[PDB]
A paper describes a structure:
Cytochrome P450 reductases (CPRs or CYPORs, EC 1.6.2.4) are diflavin oxidoreductases that supply electrons to type II cytochrome P450 monooxygenases (CYPs, EC 1.14.-.-). The structure is well conserved among the different kingdoms, possessing an N-terminal FMN-binding domain that is connected to a C-terminal FAD-binding domain via a linker region. The enzyme transfers electrons from NADPH in a typical order via flavin adenine dinucleotide (FAD) to flavin mononucleotide (FMN), which ultimately shuttles the electrons to the protein acceptors. Analysis of the CtCPR sequence revealed the presence of a single membrane-spanning region comprising the first 22 amino acids of the protein and in an attempt to produce more soluble CPR, a truncated, untagged version (Δ2–22) of the enzyme was expressed in E. coli.
The X-ray structures of CtCPR were solved with and without the cofactor, NADPH, at resolutions of 1.5 Å and 2.1 Å, respectively. Both structures were obtained in the closed conformation wherein the FMN-binding, flavodoxin-like domain interacts with the FAD and NADP- binding, ferredoxin-NADP+ reductase (FNR) like domain. In this conformation, the FMN and FAD moieties are in close proximity (~4.3 Å between the 7-methyl groups and ~3.6 Å between the 8-methyl groups), allowing direct electron transfer between the flavins. Despite the fact that CtCPR crystallized in the presence of excess NADPH, the open structure was not observed. No differences were detected between the two structures, with the exception of the presence of the 3′-phosphate-adenosine-5′-diphosphate part of NADPH, which, in contrast to the FMN and FAD cofactors, is bound through mostly side chain interactions. No density was observed for the nicotinamide mononucleotide moiety of the NAPDH, with the C-terminal Trp679 instead stacked on the re-side of the FAD. This residue is conserved among CPRs and has been implicated in the regulation of electron transfer. rCPR and hCPR have extended C-termini, with the equivalent tryptophan as the penultimate residue. As the tryptophan sterically prevents the binding of the nicotinamide part of NADPH, movement is required for hydride transfer to occur. The transition between the open and closed formations could limit hydride transfer from NADPH to FAD, as well as interflavin electron transfer, as the resting state of CPR appears to be the closed conformation during which NADPH binding occurs.
Author numbering: 45 to 679
């Protein structure tokens, strides 16, 4: 069952789609492509996670399997955790792929240095080892917001290739369900077998089982009690939540610098608009059971389950709407006036961007706009279950020290919310959940923009619990305690750096010998958004001369912006001194602008301090990144 060639033969499949995904986008695309390949070309598709197979025999693959690689790039041009073992095999163990027929679409972000490293590497290596590239390589730029149209253009070119080079008959797209739904009027919330949205099937029965003993991962969260929350900003319109999770009654462990994954539930406001949009507002307590119609289709949540539990706890109903979604559901348009508007919107890239994407409509608002508020009654819920991605966990840099508090996890989450002129709320799913927990836990008297279910399924989230798991990072304090470190992280970039500073403080407290710690921080205003403002003096008083903090208040003076890079330039001789002593550089926070500005600044200080050209210094800083002498936690 770990042999992907055997699994292809047993399920009578001729098309493999492999996804390398961290936050689900690559998965969704594998899934969309699969159905459209099957519908339009009659190919027998199977979507496979790299992590579910071993690849030692992959070179044995025969010419009758068309392979599609949908692969995202992470870390410093690293593969996604799921793809890591496949990445090792190809680069290190793979000999030939003489009869592989493949094509590759890479997901990346061009604000990052190693743009689509994994897409390009794979597309190259597979060709070098004898593979037949049946459709041109393409790739997506999540940095410019073109990723979704990028994938769409690639898919069009892959259809051209199949029709015109492999000489395949192309039929129109039609919904071909991989799953069958049956309403169970004989079943209700009273029945213990029925999911009210628990994270997995191990949380639904669970009488003679300890749900506090792990292992905990992306398949199995721990329910962690939030023992403390505070608002960290002083501004009425902008919010950042300090969260304390208690893991003391569990086997969940983290190391300083690791990520916490927080499993979301959707907002009341969003669920209402969804249920309205598809006329399900009378059906949310109706139980359904799902039965797979394809041998390789996994049902993506526990069954049986209520409509409302699927929508609240399993479907990514909020987020930008793919134009591909309009093309897939258009068949189910309520009336002919809708059909005319909808096939025109779905067929026009620019008009779709102007009328759907730029207005920040959720699926619900976009379909209700198109149909002039007629419900999309004829949409089988099965279509929705296949064509809307699983609600995936959001990652947070742990801001606690595992040496200082092995038993607590802190995160530092800035809240993303706006209100449209029409009155629509556009909300970050996880961040507004945390703002909500903070408002409720502290009886603050603020009025939530959106509301969530803080008791969760059958009151199993009661005591302000969320489902979490820890994901190990490479973002680690140096092995040798004495190695100096340079910590740069404005705004919520400070989160993991608080973790680092708290660790080194506990190390000095433990009579350990600790290197120089330099921290560059930035925020708008020392009175407004200075994260953990009062802790730093306390940390200073324990670290003594071995700690120095430089703070860039970007709006303190309205006429002149001041950023960390400015504070770095004016302390350049200290910075370079610490680099001469082997200091490790840690840059955390905004990927899109700060990370690159800071990298340039460090390059300039290297260039002057060692009398080499700026480009030679930039190449030297880039090699520090490959060696892990320069480490980034930027999102
Ligand atoms: C390794 C890593 C570490 C991180 N560390 C931190 C950290 O320490 N602190 C931190 O605050 N964040 C951190 N992040 C970011 C974090 O994972 C989340 O992306 C962030 O908190 C927002 O998640 P959300 O679920 O609240 O918003 P999401 O639900 O993901 O929404 C994303 C954005 O889209 C908007 N939006 C909603 N609907 C639409 C629509 N229809 N059209 C367009 N836009 C829409 C939302 O308002 C929001 O602004 C980290 C990310 C990574 C990858
Ligand atoms: O991040 P989040 O936690 O969301 O909060 P912010 O984005 O507000 O945090 C970023 C902080 O760094 C500043 N900043 C903005 N752009 C850059 C840049 N290119 N380089 C360095 N600093 C920058 C911001 O000042 P400002 O927002 O005033 O530009 C602010 O003080
Ligand atoms: C922490 C982090 C690091 C990233 N590093 C890179 C990178 O080095 N190169 C790149 O091209 N894209 C990078 N990206 C962009 C992702 O590849 C992109 O968001 C992708 O569309 C996500 O795919 P997934 O949801 O399937 O995991 C990074 C994104 C994040 C959040």
């Amino acid at each position: 069952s770990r042999d992907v060639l055997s699994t292809l033969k047993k399920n009578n499949k001729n098309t493999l789609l492999l996804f390398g995904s961290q936050t689900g986008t690559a998965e969704d695309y594998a899934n969309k492509l699969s159905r459209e390949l099957h519908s339009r070309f009659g190919l027998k598709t199977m979507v496979a996670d790299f992590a579910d197979y071993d690849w030692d025999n992959f070179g044995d693959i025969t010419e009758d399997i068309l392979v599609f690689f949908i692969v995202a790039t992470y870390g410093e041009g690293e593969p996604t955790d799921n793809a890591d073992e496949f990445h090792t095999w190809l680069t290190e163990e793979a000999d030939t792929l003489s009869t592989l027929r493949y094509t590759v679409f890479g997901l990346g972000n061009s604000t990052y240095e190693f743009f689509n490293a994994i897409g390009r590497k794979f597309d190259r290596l597979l060709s070098e080892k004898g593979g037949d590239r049946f459709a041109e390589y393409a790739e997506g730029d999540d940095g410019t917001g073109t990723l979704d149209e990028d994938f769409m253009a690639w898919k069009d070119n892959v259809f051209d290739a199949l029709k015109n080079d492999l000489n395949f008959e192309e039929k129109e797209l039609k919904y071909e369900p991989n799953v069958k739904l049956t309403e169970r009027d004989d079943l209700s919330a009273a029945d213990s077998q029925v999911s009210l949205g628990e994270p997995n099937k191990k949380y639904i029965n669970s009488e003679g089982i300890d749900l506090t003993k792990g292992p905990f991962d992306h398949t199995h969260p721990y329910l962690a009690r939030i023992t403390e929350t505070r608002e960290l900003f002083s501004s009425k319109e902008r919010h950042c939540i300090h969260v304390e999770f208690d893991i003391s009654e569990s086997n969940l462990k983290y190391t300083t610098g690791d990520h916490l994954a927080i499993w979301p539930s959707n907002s009341d406001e969003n669920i209402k608009q969804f249920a309205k949009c598809f006329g399900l507002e009378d059906k949310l307590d109706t139980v359904i059971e799902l039965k797979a119609l394809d041998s390789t289709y996994t049902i993506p949540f526990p069954t049986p389950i209520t409509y409302g539990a699927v929508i609240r706890h399993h479907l990514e109903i909020s987020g930008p709407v793919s134009r591909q979604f309009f093309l897939s559901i258009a068949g189910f348009a309520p009336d002919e006036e809708t059909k005319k508007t909808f096939t025109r919107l779905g067929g026009d890239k620019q008009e779709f961007a102007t009328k759907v994407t730029r207005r920040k409509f959720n699926i619900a608002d976009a379909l209700l706009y198109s149909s002039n508020n007629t419900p999309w009654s004829d949409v089988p819920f099965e279509f929705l279950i296949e064509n809307i991605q699983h609600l995936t966990p959001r990652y947070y840099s742990i801001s606690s020290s595992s040496l200082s508090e092995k038993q607590l996890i802190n995160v530092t989450a800035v809240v993303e919310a706006e209100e449209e002129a029409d009155g629509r709320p556009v909300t970050g799913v996880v961040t507004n959940l945390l703002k909500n927990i903070e408002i409720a836990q502290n009886k603050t008297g603020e009025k939530p923009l959106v509301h969530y279910d803080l008791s969760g399924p059958r009151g199993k989230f009661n005591k302000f619990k969320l489902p979490v798991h820890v994901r190990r990072s490479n973002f680690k304090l140096p092995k040798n305690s004495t190695t100096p470190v340079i910590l740069i992280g404005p705004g919520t970039g400070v989160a993991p750096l608080r973790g680092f500073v708290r660790e080194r403080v506990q190390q000095v407290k433990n009579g350990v010998n600790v290197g120089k710690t330099l921290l560059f921080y930035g925020c708008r205003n020392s009175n407004e958004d200075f994260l953990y403002k009062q802790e730093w003096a306390e940390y200073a008083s324990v670290l003594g001369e071995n700690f120095e903090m430089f703070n860039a208040f970007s709006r303190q003076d309205p006429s002149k912006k001041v950023y960390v890079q400015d504070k770095i330039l004016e302390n350049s001789q200290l910075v370079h001194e610490l680099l001469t002593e082997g200091a490790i550089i840690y840059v955390c926070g905004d990927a899109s602008r700060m990370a690159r500005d800071v990298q340039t600044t460090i390059s300039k200080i290297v260039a002057k301090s060692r009398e080499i050209s700026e480009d030679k210094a930039a190449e030297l800083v880039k090699s520090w990144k490959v060696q892990n002498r320069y480490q980034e936690d930027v999102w």
